[PDB]
Design a protein around this ligand. Sequence first.
Ligand SMILES: *[C@@H]1O[C@H](CO)[C@@H](O[C@@H]2O[C@H](CO)[C@@H](O[C@@H]3O[C@H](CO)[C@@H](O)[C@H](O[C@H]4O[C@H](CO)[C@@H](O)[C@H](O)[C@@H]4O[C@H]4O[C@H](CO)[C@@H](O)[C@H](O)[C@@H]4O)[C@@H]3O)[C@H](O)[C@H]2NC(C)=O)[C@H](O)[C@H]1NC(C)=O
Ligand SMILES: *[C@@H]1O[C@H](CO)[C@@H](O[C@@H]2O[C@H](CO)[C@@H](O[C@@H]3O[C@H](CO)[C@@H](O)[C@H](O[C@H]4O[C@H](CO)[C@@H](O)[C@H](O)[C@@H]4O[C@H]4O[C@H](CO)[C@@H](O)[C@H](O)[C@@H]4O)[C@@H]3O)[C@H](O)[C@H]2NC(C)=O)[C@H](O)[C@H]1NC(C)=O
Ligand SMILES: *[C@@H]1O[C@H](CO)[C@@H](O[C@@H]2O[C@H](CO)[C@@H](O[C@@H]3O[C@H](CO)[C@@H](O)[C@H](O[C@H]4O[C@H](CO)[C@@H](O)[C@H](O)[C@@H]4O[C@H]4O[C@H](CO)[C@@H](O)[C@H](O)[C@@H]4O)[C@@H]3O)[C@H](O)[C@H]2NC(C)=O)[C@H](O)[C@H]1NC(C)=O
Ligand SMILES: Cc1ccc(-c2ccc(NC(=O)N3CCC4(CCO4)CC3)cc2)cc1
Ligand SMILES: Cc1ccc(-c2ccc(NC(=O)N3CCC4(CCO4)CC3)cc2)cc1
Ligand SMILES: Cc1ccc(-c2ccc(NC(=O)N3CCC4(CCO4)CC3)cc2)cc1
Ligand SMILES: *[C@@H]1O[C@H](CO)[C@@H](O)[C@H](O)[C@H]1NC(C)=O
Lengths: 149, 148, 144, 96, 96, 96, 347, 350, 350
Amino acid sequence: AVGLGAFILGFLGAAGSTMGAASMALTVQARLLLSGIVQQQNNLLRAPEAQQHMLQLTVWGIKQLQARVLAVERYLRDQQLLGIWGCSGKIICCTNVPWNDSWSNKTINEIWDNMTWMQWEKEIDNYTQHIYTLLEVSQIQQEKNEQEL
Amino acid sequence: AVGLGAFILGFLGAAGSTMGAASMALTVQARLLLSGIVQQQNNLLRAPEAQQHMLQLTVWGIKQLQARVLAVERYLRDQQLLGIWGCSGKIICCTNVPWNDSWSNKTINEIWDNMTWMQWEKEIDNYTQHIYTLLEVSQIQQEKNEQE
Amino acid sequence: AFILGFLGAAGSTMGAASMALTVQARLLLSGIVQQQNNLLRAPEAQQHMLQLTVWGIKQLQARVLAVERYLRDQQLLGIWGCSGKIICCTNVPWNDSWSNKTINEIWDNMTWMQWEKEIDNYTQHIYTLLEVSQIQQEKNEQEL
Amino acid sequence: KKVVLGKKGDTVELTCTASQKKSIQFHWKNSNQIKILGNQGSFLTKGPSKLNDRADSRRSLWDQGNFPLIIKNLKIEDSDTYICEVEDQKEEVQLL
Amino acid sequence: KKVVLGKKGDTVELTCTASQKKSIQFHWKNSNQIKILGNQGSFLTKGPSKLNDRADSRRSLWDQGNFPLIIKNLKIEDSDTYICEVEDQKEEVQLL
Amino acid sequence: KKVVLGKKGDTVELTCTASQKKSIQFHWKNSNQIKILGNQGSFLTKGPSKLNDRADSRRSLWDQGNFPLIIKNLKIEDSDTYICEVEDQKEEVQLL
Amino acid sequence: KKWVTVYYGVPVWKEATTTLFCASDAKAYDTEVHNVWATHACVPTDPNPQEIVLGNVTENFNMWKNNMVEQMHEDIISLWDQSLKPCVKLTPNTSVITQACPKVSFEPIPIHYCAPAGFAILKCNSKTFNGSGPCTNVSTVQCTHGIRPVVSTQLLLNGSLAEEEIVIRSENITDNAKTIIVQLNEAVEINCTRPNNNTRKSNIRQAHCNISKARWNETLGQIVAKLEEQFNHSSGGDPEIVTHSFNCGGEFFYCNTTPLFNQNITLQCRIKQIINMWQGVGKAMYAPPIRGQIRCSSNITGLLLTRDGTFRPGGGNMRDNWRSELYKYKVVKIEPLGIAPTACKRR
Amino acid sequence: KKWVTVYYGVPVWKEATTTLFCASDAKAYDTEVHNVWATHACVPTDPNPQEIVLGNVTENFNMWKNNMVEQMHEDIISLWDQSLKPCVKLTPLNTSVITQACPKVSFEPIPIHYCAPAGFAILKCNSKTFNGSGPCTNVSTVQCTHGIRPVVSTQLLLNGSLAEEEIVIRSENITDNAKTIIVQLNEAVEINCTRPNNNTRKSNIRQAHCNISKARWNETLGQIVAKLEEQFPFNHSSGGDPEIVTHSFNCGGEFFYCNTTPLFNQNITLQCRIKQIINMWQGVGKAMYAPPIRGQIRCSSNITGLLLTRDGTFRPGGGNMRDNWRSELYKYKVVKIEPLGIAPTACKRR
Amino acid sequence: KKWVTVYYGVPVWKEATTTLFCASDAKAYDTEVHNVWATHACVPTDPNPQEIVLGNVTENFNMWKNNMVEQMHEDIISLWDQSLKPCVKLTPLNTSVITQACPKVSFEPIPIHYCAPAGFAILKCNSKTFNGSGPCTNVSTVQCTHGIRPVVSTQLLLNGSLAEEEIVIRSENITDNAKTIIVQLNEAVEINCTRPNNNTRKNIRQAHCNISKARWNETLGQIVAKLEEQFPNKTFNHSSGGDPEIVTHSFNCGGEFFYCNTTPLFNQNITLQCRIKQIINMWQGVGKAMYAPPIRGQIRCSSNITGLLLTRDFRPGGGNMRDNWRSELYKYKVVKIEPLGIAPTACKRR
Ligand SMILES: *[C@@H]1O[C@H](CO)[C@@H](O[C@@H]2O[C@H](CO)[C@@H](O[C@@H]3O[C@H](CO)[C@@H](O)[C@H](O[C@H]4O[C@H](CO)[C@@H](O)[C@H](O)[C@@H]4O[C@H]4O[C@H](CO)[C@@H](O)[C@H](O)[C@@H]4O)[C@@H]3O)[C@H](O)[C@H]2NC(C)=O)[C@H](O)[C@H]1NC(C)=O
Ligand SMILES: *[C@@H]1O[C@H](CO)[C@@H](O[C@@H]2O[C@H](CO)[C@@H](O[C@@H]3O[C@H](CO)[C@@H](O)[C@H](O[C@H]4O[C@H](CO)[C@@H](O)[C@H](O)[C@@H]4O[C@H]4O[C@H](CO)[C@@H](O)[C@H](O)[C@@H]4O)[C@@H]3O)[C@H](O)[C@H]2NC(C)=O)[C@H](O)[C@H]1NC(C)=O
Ligand SMILES: *[C@@H]1O[C@H](CO)[C@@H](O[C@@H]2O[C@H](CO)[C@@H](O[C@@H]3O[C@H](CO)[C@@H](O)[C@H](O[C@H]4O[C@H](CO)[C@@H](O)[C@H](O)[C@@H]4O[C@H]4O[C@H](CO)[C@@H](O)[C@H](O)[C@@H]4O)[C@@H]3O)[C@H](O)[C@H]2NC(C)=O)[C@H](O)[C@H]1NC(C)=O
Ligand SMILES: Cc1ccc(-c2ccc(NC(=O)N3CCC4(CCO4)CC3)cc2)cc1
Ligand SMILES: Cc1ccc(-c2ccc(NC(=O)N3CCC4(CCO4)CC3)cc2)cc1
Ligand SMILES: Cc1ccc(-c2ccc(NC(=O)N3CCC4(CCO4)CC3)cc2)cc1
Ligand SMILES: *[C@@H]1O[C@H](CO)[C@@H](O)[C@H](O)[C@H]1NC(C)=O
């Protein structure tokens, strides 16, 4: 809902769809929005006209903007913080750290077609710190190797 | 003129010249700014000092912020939505889809030096959806082979 | 808030600042640390309306300006081939005459406040060279 | 064409319509492009012609997309063709 | 279990505790799970048994983590065990 | 330097100037660097010396970049040099 | 060679439809209809307009295909039904409703239209624009100039001037069924008075308007000189068509303009209670005239003419009259993503 | 090529806590306690509620482990301490006793809603078969709650929401015979409580009576029992502090204690008394309030629920204000979203 | 090796100027000059100061080459021109003379502070030792300065800030005998200035100020102890003369213009001999103006001496109000951040 974000709200609908479906959904929306097919709509609150509405439409006016501004800072922040694993400036980023069956012994189509992110990120929650560490290490080694060529 | 971010300002300027000139002028201003030679003027409405400006500078204050915040969001969305054609995070994206003369049988110098973006995007507006489709297809094929 | 998270490193060395940014970003990516902001609350009462609206709006204007500069620079840097990056390594060699110092001396025994004074008179020169290299690199690839 | 026959001294009605039912501004003109009637929004004008007098329109129907020309006390000289000016629908109707 | 021996015809205070040093919900129940005494936030209530009457607690010590059961004019028939329900610390005591 | 010969009892009018035509802090001092006359923004002050008296200026010309030292009832004993302190334009003049 | 290149920040604008905000100098304390209505409808105007002239950008404008006109019209319908309420309102079988009629003052104030969240408004600054076609001087604003919501027919009052020359503009100047708008480059004062001594009845509904003969004839002369490059009694119809109909002070006036189209020449004016409505087809009754003296003073800024297939000054209806102010504005949006071939290829 | 791939836009919820803020339609000119409090404590109400349904996402709720309850607790005790000031306040120490001046004030609870700070949102369960905990199959997101009146209630729950179709019996452990069972009714029972202005006599001035419609009362219990019998194939309170034993409440600033014996065992009348000595619900302690108001006081309340207990065949329970708030806050939880996630993908870097 | 690398987010500031704005606790209802000016000129004060210490940063704060001083100057001139209006104002031209009515207003300076516009910040020195314009080792960043009352007193610096621990003596050149030496005290000394109700004779223009002997003597002994640091072999006198605003210790209190004879201070209850005058040399620029005759009633100031101005050729002196403001606005500078920097690194592009 409003107050939660900007980026995430666009990506929050169909939260119960599978992750495969979510990817396809994002792809079609970009086709529709890059193209001239889908028009944009705004969700902005109106400024007051009269003194009687000054508190009501100023407090919420400011709060809506604060939420959206912070959402932008988080989007942009995270987009560069992620450069540690090499994946800066990306939504989807493929790396060379292999998946172990010790993390999840499932196939790719089982994970992408019969599961939502809501379940997936709970099933492997205890491997999060481990995997993230490996991603950092892999990026460091890649940088080392390229600089040596 | 509506506070459509800081992004669409230099482009009101660009609207008045050729496509070539627009790229040039943007390059020039950009280097002057990077170098610390010139500075941009901040245009932020003064919040009111006095009671008589309530419902005036407070409404126009919020209205400018909404226009600017929204412009930033729209900007960022396009920068990432362009991932479909492999053009995310860019102002200029050169692709591997060739131009057809059937879209426009003109010389590159004629296109960039004797025309403005305002005319260019009208003369070939009927091929826009077509080209966009081709760009997606090409990006998919490139990923398909890059991943082999 | 781009500058705010970086300016607090003033007084530390250049190397220390780079390490600090790497670590904090890592903690954030992993969900290890939590943050609170410094936003001013909108007024509860009509009596606090000028007080929490004037500063409410000014704070938002400052944050919007900060993102506009951030994004502007991230793309203006395309000229040197540094767009989209915080750190951009190029193929223009350092001319020793600009400093005559070792990399470790610069990064470990100096801060950015000192370093950028030491080489201030070569700023325009270096920037010019960076543009030239990017132009040549673009040609080299387009020529193939 | 919408063609009707009248007799000297009677009252007849010719009609123009709009499918949108938005009271689209209309005009009535004869074969020599002489203005007979027309509206200005909700108001009824008369043309500065021989048909200025003894002319009317059931204005309550304009909001229903019906823009009639009513000519009272017809003379044989009034039995002309008429052109509808509604939207781009330059339809011909005729009085015999 | 913790066993407390009195003089039978007297008043006995049995206790349940919590390390939180906070007033929290608690209950005392007998061997047939019949409520004896417990709280309702800050308030003291009695359980609908033979120990409904002749009973008390120390409301003032609930924020010290001490939740006593005081049985007055104790009878031999009352020498049962009791289960504490404080947090998940389901301790048992016996009264003799 | 600029040297001016006067007669006993007359008025001197030595000047210091500034091309800026701004409100400028300035001072006049003798050869021993003893203050004679100077300003404090719009205000005129005097120095703690033999020239504390018999001295004036032209306040009305200060924003025109003209800062005079006017010694009245000139004596031959006043035939010293004077140093201007206007901005960094430390010019010297002398009386005879 | 000649490869597709995608560009972002492409300065291409297209006409678009959005809902506009209104803005005005409302007072909110003086009981007057427009200030009170505006208090709960419009915000104060942009304190710092940008007026950015876009170089020599040429833009195709067309005042007769515009939609800003509808935005103004819808707001006006709300303004009038919410203020100068008729005692009896009859409209489509038909039905009638009735209302209490407190009287209120009525003095139109300028109302500006503003475009939110992008949607810049382009303005034509050409003096030779003539209603439609490419405009060679285009600027961009967030808010339009203010337009007073005047509902006069025939002669239009308190609008803007053409400044240098009289402009004759129409959708089809050779058809003449459609109203031709004559925008004056000069205003002519009109002084309308109903003295408090006209107390008789069977008078209380009579008034007269003072027009300078010299100013009027100078104006007609310039209009004709311009018309000649391509003035009689009005033709007839409802009284809102036939006479110079206007509302001032809340009173509804119907003035006889024969003296203008045939010094201190006067129009013969009546004040009426039975008014044909312009909100749709229907009629309404308003309470009888205010006891006392009413004096109105206005600037004649335009003339509405029709001609047959030498002019009849019988034009004007609501939503058409406002085109005389909105002719120079359009709302556009930017589509920053575009394509051009260039001298490169990917990789 | 089943390699780790990093993604943004992963809509994965985590329960989180935050300093939620309150909002209400406060007035600041009517002198009443809530509107002279909420005007400095709470902001104007949400101008545009969204109710976004999150598809068919199933989310686990637990009304007894919620944190929104603590936020409600702290704000209400602040409200009370800052308004309904006792003349004598007694806090355990030995004891600590202080005194205050006692202007009387009007006291009429208004709905107050809690709203998420930026970066947070509140999920709510729209299930008609809520149960009390476990998976909810209809989840929507809002910034703010619907608005809950800070009504003390104590024995029976007054001026809350209804279950609409069925009476919902909610308990952390329905068979432990220890925890209070919260009963949410599908119909409100109207109660009309009056102290007529003829009660001017002294030992009278502390007497009042409440009228309950018999048909509504008996039908309500019949439905409750019918459900209790499904869970488990008829008495009054056991005793204790008077606030638990009787249906105590604060209305008009006065503290009423109504005898519900006639209800638990037309125009059923309860004997009520107005007291000056009240055991506090805010914590352990006691307080004295100013003597009764001369005049006629009438309260009209909606019973929307009950606090019942069952032993090791049911009774009224009461007090424990956290439970009264749970009865309305059960539908809501605060979450944050962690947009960065990972999954195996058939790909390689380059 | 040693290739050029570009870094964005570099924590480097450089001096900059800007149209810095004021904020104050303005009231708009008390008729007083500052509170009927600041209500249109200044915003409410900063509700959430940050005071961020920049690590180990050492930086130069040259109070005599600052720009914040000019902004303060222009705003004070507007304040005065718009309030304490003379009946006759004379400006150099020949002259140009205009007249005004002399309504009287009260005059009680309130703290006013300056705040940074978006993109800017103010650095401040928090050290005890500054060496005048030199570097200090305690630097923090703020959005707004400490409030300063815009007092235009002349020989003594009234109602300013304190040095807290030691008397701090500052000059661009402590030895050129051209600069005014600013002395900031670590303690305030009260000056009880009164114009009593019995002054009805013509006396109506007489006044007096009472200063503690113990306080004056201790303060001056402490000043000497610090003067000895620069002048260890030397050893406070009557001023030399000049415009009366300099010669006597003038100030504006209650709207009256006081001229106090400080001879007793620079040589309990030391009594200064004060007069109230109507013909005043303007401090605002070169020119003169006339004010209305004295107020019939009793006016008292009870001001704080928080500093003084000395000159050496160590006499009292003053004027050039911008230099008094330099003291009060001492230790602040406006800077902006330049996010790009370049350094050599051990890497290469492709
Ligand atoms: C073009 O613009 C011009 C402005 O440049 C417009 O001109 C203004 O027109 C209004 C028309 O009403 C006129 O307003 C009156 O001014 C009077 C000033 O003395 C007021 O006294 C008068 O108020 C009375 O009449 C109102 C009804 O109209 C009542 O509502 C009000 O309560 C007052 O009525 C009481 O007093 C009278 C007098 O004793 C008595 O008869 C009543 O019974 C009652 O007791 C109006 O406010 C403005 O003064 C004109 N402005 C100028 C500069 O001339 C012009 O209208 C615009 N043109 C168009 C077409 O809109
Ligand atoms: C559940 O919700 C319902 C609403 O849906 C709540 O019902 C409301 O309860 C309040 C309780 O006070 C009641 O308010 C009173 O209404 C009276 C109308 O006549 C007022 O007269 C009365 O004001 C007097 O008492 C106040 C103190 O109680 C004083 O502060 C005030 O100044 C008035 O007192 C003076 O005047 C009287 C009369 O002359 C005199 O006796 C006094 O001595 C003194 O001089 C209150 O405003 C509402 O009317 C009820 N609303 C409805 C629709 O019935 C219900 O309370 C909620 N339930 C719970 C448990 O909270
Ligand atoms: C340093 O800081 C201190 C604060 O710590 C400042 O001290 C304050 O100074 C003001 C100004 O003098 C003083 O305000 C007056 O207090 C009086 C108390 O009795 C009021 O009576 C007086 O109001 C009258 O005078 C005003 C004009 O000065 C009028 O505008 C006003 O309407 C009043 O007029 C009536 O009374 C007078 C006097 O009898 C009579 O002549 C009139 O005809 C009429 O009848 C002011 O409010 C504060 O009280 C002082 N504060 C303290 C604690 O003492 C000090 O001034 C600062 N120093 C400098 C140099 O700025
Ligand atoms: C403030 C703000 C900033 C950015 C955004 C935003 C919107 C849409 C996307 N789109 C996306 O992630 N997609 C997935 C990858 C793909 C398929 C092949 O390319 C295109 C679609 C990203 C960010 C929203 C708000
Ligand atoms: C509006 C706004 C926009 C962006 C930001 C922002 C915050 C933090 C970073 N982080 C960073 O610069 N780092 C350095 C490079 C590194 C070390 C190895 O990779 C990771 C960490 C960037 C932008 C804040 C606000
Ligand atoms: C919120 C926000 C604010 C400002 C901007 C902004 C960013 C970049 C430009 N610059 C540009 O378009 N250029 C042309 C191409 C080139 C030459 C080689 O790269 C660089 C210069 C303008 C505005 C975007 C978002
Ligand atoms: C329903 O309530 C009972 C209470 O004892 C609990 O055990 C059960 O887990 C709850 N939820 C569901 C879905 O059964």
